[PDB]
């Protein structure tokens, strides 16, 4: 390369939203260093003291100029999870409405889990699919991570399933939309691993979008992934993920969702968590349908096609072999124009902040005696849209 | 407003004078990684995971950004306290520069800020120009335009300086010191070693180590002495509240040495010279030299007096008006456009004939976080520069 080339390459890298060394990732680096060094113990070191003093006025200006939590008015707590809460907010200046997921920095470190969010960020930020919930801004402070997404007013599939005996027409529509959306994620080289109705959200038109990309992972050259982590609720997970694989695992979960929609309960439910794991491992004999003519021949066929060992699982050869399945044969929609058709349940909403589909809903780090670098696992999480 | 805050934050990342422009920010990451890559500290998972995460990236960054291996070293054209100056050729552009190196370890065992600043933004034909300023874990680098004509020490050592020449060189020093003063700085250490010659034989000031910013009264309050033992003014020597009058004392010393051949307060020992300075009232004497003109003597004595009566106390113009400078060859306003008394005859773009023939220890591995690279974050001048 030439002199100019090297300069222009470096210059563009400061401007790239996919760059690790963007103007924003670099500002995080400084902001972190200053948080982890402002203690009296460490200030005994002159290098540390002089540095902090030198960058006092500057670090403050930035802390006040950059996007902060006090820039938003909180409207309602629309959810709760492991390491935080999701809330309906209004950006005080623009007056624009968003869903904001908060993640506790102290808790994440304590609970040793402090790297999942990376996958969740990139997916929502750059997916640019009508099937993925859109990330507009990502920011932070010494205590939390913030994800500013577009608000899904229709609620989740858990709420839908709880308010209707789902007819087969609807189950076909919702399964198909899940299939198209999982395929979009796979096409970005990702495996979800724990697909559940809690992750399936409804837009203002009643169409599907996937959310909460916690368990997601990037595939290797062979389209494969390795792990050994703590399973949450085993109910929706593939046997091979519990036994610990490729994207076949996400198709196992689709069969569990299609079962639950039509039967009313999950196929491997048991009292205890360990109970559910046993039923999954012994799927070959545990999977049974009730004696009511209700489920069609093809619905049963597709369920069993997905609820088998990976080696014979519908999907092992690709999306198209799932799409071709007779269960989907219909006179209402084409796969290529489905998200343009009329959704089976269209939400009737009172406002831009209607929260009718959502059910009605502080330990910090100690002072360190030496350098601990608690802010280091979060440098570069920041993101802004233009 | 929302936009206002973006714009404000945006002008800050772009400003070459900003503390948080792309240049400083990249230095901040580069530093953190250097001060953390040790086995002791890597036992901390936060530290290990961070380093592993930013491995591939920090390397790309290091390979792209300006580094010392981008230059071919032609000769060591100097040495000083904290490093060496060398004639280099940028391997890609093939362009020739003088590069001053400063040992990061030795410095620890903050003058460079004033020096960097003056050379980068002076925008005067009297000041040596800074093009790039880069670093690493061991050195600071200052890429300046190469002065092929050498210093005034070399000139004075190869010629019996005639008065015509001494007038020219003094005048150019006067114009250049005034330029620094106009940037609100006291030079504090004016000497022939700091006076360099361009390809045309014209003056430029270099090595701005001792440079300090004047206050509202155009004064400096230093509790300790600063400068060279022979050029140091009585008031800096006993520091301390003083002004730019001190630089004019040194011009006197520089005038006397060019005409007499020796410094005015020279003595056997260094302590001896200090004594003679403090007694400038009786020590200043001229030899039986049927060549030092009446005015040359007058100007020397005008500068070599106590500050209260020193030529310059009222301003540059009273120095300029002095009869010593009365001549029919140049005007003050068109002097650097006149033909220099010694025009260097140079063989190439890398002719180093005016430079005498010339011919490493680092920080130990730390057991805990020391942050030895923190006093240098922001010294880089490459990404965000004034054009
Ligand atoms: C992993 O730790 C946590 C912490 C807190 C909450 C949760 C659940 C969770 O992930 N909810 C999500 N909600 C949205 C969301 C997007 C658009 N609109 C609406 N209404 C909700 C995206 S992810 C998990
Ligand atoms: C601070 O301690 C040190 C360390 C290393 C060298 C020195 C002497 C010193 O300051 N030399 C200079 N040389 C130049 C220079 C510019 C253009 N062209 C040419 N040929 C030389 C500028 S400053 C002092």
Ligand 2 atom, smallest distance to B101 CA: 5
Residue A371 near chain B (CB below 8 Å): yes
Residue B167 CB partners (closer than 8 Å, separation 6+): B324, B325, B327
Please write down the HEC assignment for all residues of A278-328. Answer: HHHHCHHHHCCCCCCCCCCHHHHHHHHHHCCCHHHCCCCCCHHHHHCCHHH
Q: What is the DSSP string of B80-107?
A: -SS-EEEEEEETTT--EEEEEEEEHHHH
Residue A271 near chain B (CB below 8 Å): no
Closest by CA position to A198, among listed A218, A219, A176, A214: A214
| Residues listed for chain A | 386
Residues B383/A10, Cβ–Cβ less than 8 Å: yes
Which residues of A are part of a known binding site for ATP? Answer: 78-86, 101
B85 is in an annotated binding site: yes
Residue B20 near chain A (CB below 8 Å): yes
Residue B77 to residue B98: CA distance in whole angstroms: 8
Please write down the HEC assignment for all residues of chain A. Answer: CCHHHHHHHHHHHCCCCCCCCCHHHHHHHHHHHHHCCCCCCHHHCHHHHHHHHHCHHHHHHHHHHCCCHHHEEEEEEEEECCCCEEEEEEECCCCCEEEEEEEEHHHHHHCCCCCCHHHHHHHHHHCCCCCECCEEEEEECCCEEEEEECCCCCCEHHHHHHHCCCCHHHHHHHHHHHHHHHHHHHCCCEECCCCCHHHEEECCCCCEEECCCCCCEECCCCCECCCCCCCCCHHHCCHHHHCCCECHHHHHHHHHHHHHHHHCCCCCCCCCHHHHHHHHHCHHHHCCCCCCCCCCHHHHHHHHHHCCCHHHCCCCCCHHHHHCCHHHCCCCCCHHHHHHCCCCCCCCCCCCCCCCCCCCCCCCCCCCCCCCCCCHHHCCCCEECC
Instruction: Write the CA distances from A214 to A124, A255, B255, B348, integer angstroms.
Output: 11, 21, 77, 65
Ligand 1 atom, smallest distance to A150 CA: 17
Neighbours of A337 (CB within 10 A): 8
> Which residues make up the CATH 3.30.200.20 domain(s) of chain A?
1-155+349-386
B84 is in an annotated binding site: yes
Is the Cβ atom of A156 under 6 angstroms away from ligand 1? no
Residue A143 near chain B (CB below 8 Å): no
Residue A373 structure tokens = 């670098």
Residue A116 structure tokens = 């999942």
* B356-365: b (≥16 Cβ within 10 Å) or e: eeeeeeeeee
Residues B178/B316, Cβ–Cβ less than 8 Å: yes
Give the 3-state secondary structure of residue B341.
coil
* A3-34: b (≥16 Cβ within 10 Å) or e: eeebbeebeebbeeeebbbbbbbbbbbbbbbb
For domain A1-155+349-386, give its CATH number from 3.40.640.10, 3.30.565.10, 3.30.200.20, 1.10.287.40.
3.30.200.20
Residue B374 near chain A (CB below 8 Å): yes
Residues A379/A29, Cβ–Cβ less than 8 Å: yes
Closest by CA position to A67, among listed A88, A87, A84, A92: A92
B201 is in an annotated binding site: no
- 């395929």: which residue's tokens? A183
- Helix %, strand %, coil % of chain B (to 5): 40, 15, 45
**Ligand 1 atom 8, closest CA:** A81
Neighbours of A313 (CB within 10 A): 19
Ligand at minimal distance from the CA of B352 is 2
As for ligand 2, residues whose beta carbon falls within 6 Å of it are B 77-85, 98, 100, 102, 128, 144, 146-147, 196, 206-207, 209
Q: Cβ B370–A47 below 8 Å, yes or no?
A: yes
| B chain contacts of residue A14, beta-carbon cutoff 8 Å | 22, 383
Give the 3-state secondary structure of residue B183.
coil
Ligand 1 atom, smallest distance to A103 CA: 4
For residue B117, indicate whether it is catalytic: no
| A chain contacts of residue B47, beta-carbon cutoff 8 Å | 373, 376
Can you give the C-alpha Rg of chain A in angstroms? Answer: 24
Give the residue on A whose Cα is nearest the Cα of B95.
A3
Residue A123 to residue A213: CA distance in whole angstroms: 8
Strand partners, A208: A202
Residue A243 CB partners (closer than 8 Å, separation 6+): A281
Measured distance between the N- and C-terminal CA atoms of chain B, rounded to whole angstroms: 31
Closest by CA position to B382, among listed B143, B123, B71, B181: B143
> Which residues make up the CATH 3.30.200.20 domain(s) of chain B?
1-150+346-387
> Which residues make up the CATH 1.10.510.10 domain(s) of chain A?
156-348
Catalytic choice (A24, A122, A183, A194): A194
Neighbours of B231 (CB within 10 A): 26
Distance from the CA of B247 to the center of ligand 2, in angstroms? Answer: 20
Give the 3-state secondary structure of residue B214.
coil
Strand partners, A135: A149
Residue A307 to residue B1: CA distance in whole angstroms: 55
Q: Cβ B32–A29 below 8 Å, yes or no?
A: yes
Task: Tell me the resolution in Å.
Answer: 3.3
Residue A362 structure tokens = 């502080």
Is the Cβ atom of A85 under 6 angstroms away from ligand 1? yes
Residue B383 near chain A (CB below 8 Å): yes
Is the Cβ atom of A132 under 6 angstroms away from ligand 1? no
Q: Where are the alpha helices (DSSP H) in chain B?
A: 2-14, 22-34, 45-53, 55-64, 104-108, 112-121, 152-158, 163-181, 234-237, 245-260, 270-278, 280-283, 294-303, 316-320
Residue A138 to residue A126: CA distance in whole angstroms: 13
Angle, helices A56-65 vs A23-35, to 10°: value is 120
- CA within 13 Å, CB half, B173: 29
Residue B30 to residue B34: CA distance in whole angstroms: 6
Q: The domain B1-150+346-387: what is its CATH number?
A: 3.30.200.20
Residue A47 CB partners (closer than 8 Å, separation 6+): B370, B371, B372, B374, B375
Residues B262/B307, Cβ–Cβ less than 8 Å: no
- 């020490």: which residue's tokens? B153
Residues A177/A207, Cβ–Cβ less than 8 Å: yes
Query: How many contacts does A have with B, using Cβ atoms within 8 A?
Result: 94
Q: Indicate the residue of A50, A62, A93 with minimum beta-carbon distance to B2.
A: A93
Closest by CA position to B121, among listed B202, B36, B208: B208
Q: How far is A70 from chain B (nearest CA, A)?
A: 13
| The CA-based dihedral angle spanning residues B293, B296, B297, B302, taken in that order and rounded to the nearest 10 degrees | 160
Q: To which H or E segment does residue B333 belong?
A: none
Residue A9 near chain B (CB below 8 Å): yes
Residue A106 CB partners (closer than 8 Å, separation 6+): A143, A363, A364, A365
Q: Which of B74, B133, B206, B360 to mutate to test the pocket of ligand 2 (most atoms within 8 A of CB)?
A: B206
Q: How far is A127 from chain B (nearest CA, A)?
A: 23
Q: The domain B151-345: what is its CATH number?
A: 1.10.510.10
Give the 3-state secondary structure of residue B384.
coil
Distance from the CA of B92 to the center of ligand 2, in angstroms? Answer: 24
Residues B67/B136, Cβ–Cβ less than 8 Å: yes
Residue A46 to residue B27: CA distance in whole angstroms: 19
Distance from the CA of B333 to the center of ligand 2, in angstroms? Answer: 29
Residues B97/B90, Cβ–Cβ less than 8 Å: yes
Domain covering A156-348 assigned CATH 1.10.3720.10 in the classification: no
Angle, helices B2-14 vs A56-65, to 10°: value is 140
Instruction: Write the CA distances from B385 to A93, B16, B155, integer angstroms.
Output: 34, 5, 35
Measured over the CA atoms of residue B11, residue B12, residue B16 and residue B21, the dihedral's sign is negative
A residues 50-79 closer than 8 Å to B (CB): 50-51, 55, 58, 61-62, 65-66
Give the 3-state secondary structure of residue B250.
helix
* φ, ψ of residue A252 in degrees (nearest 5): -60, -50
* φ, ψ of residue B16 in degrees (nearest 5): -65, -20
Give the residue on B whose Cα is nearest the Cα of A109.
B46
Closest by CA position to B248, among listed B165, B321, B179, B177: B177
DSSP secondary structure code for residue B336 in this structure = G
Q: Cβ A51–B375 below 8 Å, yes or no?
A: yes
* A217-233: b (≥16 Cβ within 10 Å) or e: beeeeeeebeeeeebee
Can you give the C-alpha Rg of chain B in angstroms? Answer: 24
Catalytic choice (B27, B117, B151, B189): B189
């Amino acid at each position: 390369m030439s002199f100019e080339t090297r300069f222009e390459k470096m210059d563009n890298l400061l401007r790239d939203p996919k760059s690790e060394v963007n103007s924003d990732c670099l500002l995080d680096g400084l902001d972190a260093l200053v948080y982890d060094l402002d203690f009296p113990a460490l200030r005994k070191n002159k290098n540390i003291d002089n540095f902090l003093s030198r960058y006092k006025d500057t670090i403050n200006k930035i802390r006040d100029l950059r996007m902060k939590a006090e820039d938003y008015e909180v409207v309602k707590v629309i959810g709760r999870g492991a390491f935080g809460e999701v809330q309906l907010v209004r950006h005080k200046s623009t007056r624009k409405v968003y869903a904001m997921k908060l993640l506790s920095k102290f808790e994440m470190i304590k609970r040793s889990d402090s790297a999942f969010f990376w996958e969740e960020r990139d997916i929502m930020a750059f997916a640019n699919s009508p099937w993925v919930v859109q990330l507009f801004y990502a920011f932070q402070d010494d205590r939390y991570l913030y994800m500013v997404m577009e608000y899904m007013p229709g609620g989740d599939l858990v709420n839908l399933m709880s308010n209707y005996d789902v007819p087969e027409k609807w189950a076909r529509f919702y399964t198909a939309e899940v299939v198209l959306a999982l395929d979009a994620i796979h096409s970005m080289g990702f495996i979800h691993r724990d697909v559940k109705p809690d992750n399936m959200l409804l837009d203002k038109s009643g169409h599907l979008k996937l959310a909460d990309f916690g368990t997601c992972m990037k595939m290797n050259k062979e389209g494969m992934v390795r792990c050994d982590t703590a399973v949450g609720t085993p109910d929706y997970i593939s046997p091979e993920v519990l036994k610990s694989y490729g994207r076949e695992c996400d198709w196992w979960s689709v069969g569990v969702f299609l079962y639950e929609m039509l039967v009313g309960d999950t196929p491997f439910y048991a009292d205890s968590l360990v109970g559910t794991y046993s039923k999954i491992m012994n799927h070959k004999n545990s999977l049974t349908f009730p004696d009511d003519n209700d489920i069609s021949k093809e619905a049963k066929n597709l369920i069993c096609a997905f609820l088998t060992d990976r080696e014979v699982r519908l999907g092992r050869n690709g999306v198209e072999e799932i799409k071709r399945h007779l269960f989907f044969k219909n006179d209402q929609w084409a796969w290529e124009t489905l998200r343009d058709t009329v959704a089976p349940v269209v939400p009737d909403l009172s406002s831009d902040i209607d929260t009718s589909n959502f059910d009605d809903l502080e330990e910090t780090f100690p002072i360190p005696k030496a350098f601990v670098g608690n802010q280091l696992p979060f440098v570069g999480f920041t993101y802004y849209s233009n």
